[PDB]
Amino acid sequence: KFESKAALLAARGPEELLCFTERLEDLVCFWEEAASAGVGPGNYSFSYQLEDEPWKLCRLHQAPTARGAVRFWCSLPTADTSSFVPLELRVTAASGAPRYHRVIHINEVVLLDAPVGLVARLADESGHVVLRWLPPPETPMTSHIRYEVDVSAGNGAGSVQRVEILEGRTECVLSNLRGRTRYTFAVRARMAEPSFGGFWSAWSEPVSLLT
Amino acid sequence: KFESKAALLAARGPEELLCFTERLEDLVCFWEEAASAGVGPGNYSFSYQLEDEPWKLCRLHQAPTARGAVRFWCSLPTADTSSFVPLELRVTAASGAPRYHRVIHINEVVLLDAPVGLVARLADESGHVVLRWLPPPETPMTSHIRYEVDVSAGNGAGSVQRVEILEGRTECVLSNLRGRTRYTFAVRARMAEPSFGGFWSAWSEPVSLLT
C-alpha cells in the first residue's frame, strides 16, 4: 500500500486509446474517463477492421480504475488478432461524435508477462555472478525476446545498473564486480525488432546475492 | 600454389554424395571418383523425390578434378529447392545397379558465398581497431547470418586468435592488440540455428593494418 498509495498520487496527463498484446493471439484496448451518471458502454461503440475485412464492432465493458475513474474496454476474438496487417480502430459516442481513431499493428504493441525462475549463483571457480532465468510463461516466439538485467543494492551505492541482453538468451555472467556486497537483481522481457515491437515488461521477481 | 599443392597432398575419405545450397533457391549435388576409359555422365541416373512430388531426374555433368579424378554433378531446377521438406536422393548405374541414396533438407545444407567489402580502421578517439564488411552478395535472410573473424599477426608472432560475432552484425571492434604490429583480418559466414544449418564459407579477401 506504499507502492499502492504511490500510484493513486502519481498523476499522468491526457487520455489515449491504449492497446497491447500479451501472447500473439489477443488484443485488449481501453481508455479511462471521469465517472459520470449512467454513462455506461451503451453510450459508445468500438469499431475495428482488419485491412480488407468487413468492419466489426466489439463489446465494450466497464470496471473501475483504482483511482476512481472508469475504464472502458474491448477484447478482440483471437480469430481477428492477426499480425503483420493494419488494424483500424474507431471509438464513437452514440451522438455521432468521434472519440478516438487509431491504426495499429498488433505485432508492434506487445507487452509480455515478466520472466520467471530467476536464479543467481557464484561461479565458484572464477568467483562471481552467474545469472540465469525463464521467459514469460506460456508465451511463443521465445527466440525473439530481448532481455534487460538490473544489477543493484550494496548500501548507499544506488547502483541500479542495467545490462542489455540479446534475444533468446537466458543466462548472463555478471563476471566482474565486488567482494562482500549485498546485491539484488531483476529482469525485463521485450519482443525484439524489427518484426515485433512493443513495451518493456514489469521487472521479474528480484534475487539477492551477498558476494 | 602452396595452398593448392598442400591441398593436392592432403588425405581422403571414401565416396560420399555431396549437396549444398548457396542462396536459398538452388541445390548442387556431386560425387568424385577415378578417371575411366569409356565412362560418362550417361552411365548413371540421378533422381530425386521432393516429398509428395513424384520422382524426377536431374542430368549429370562430368568435370575433371585437379587431382586427376572425375566429378559428377547436377544442379536441381528452381521449383524443386523447397526448404522444410525431406528430399529423397538416389544415384544409380545405367543397369539399375545401385550407387547412392541420401535424404536431406536444403535449409540444413547452406554453403554461402564469402563476405565482401571488409575494411579495417583505427578508431582515433580510443586507439581501437574497427572491422567492417557486408554480407555475401545477393544473399537473402541476412540477419540470420553469423560471422567469424580471423586475426593473424606479424612475423614470428601469431597465436591463433578467432572472434565470434553474432548474427546480423557486420562490424566488430578489436580492442587489446600489440602496438606497431601488422594484423591481417578476414571473415567467413554461416546460417545460424535452429532454422538453417550448413557449412562455414570461405574466408573473405583480408585487410591488413599497422597498429
Binding site: 482488419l50 492477426s82 496487417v85 524489427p194 518484426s195 | 537473402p140 535472410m141 540477419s143 540470420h144
Partner: peptide
C-alpha cells in the same frame, strides 16, 4: 496462419 517468404533481412509474412 501466415504466408511467408525469404526477404533480404528476415521473413516477410502476411495473414493467410
Amino acid at each position: 496462419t501466415y504466408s511467408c517468404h525469404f526477404g533480404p533481412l528476415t521473413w516477410v509474412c502476411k495473414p493467410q
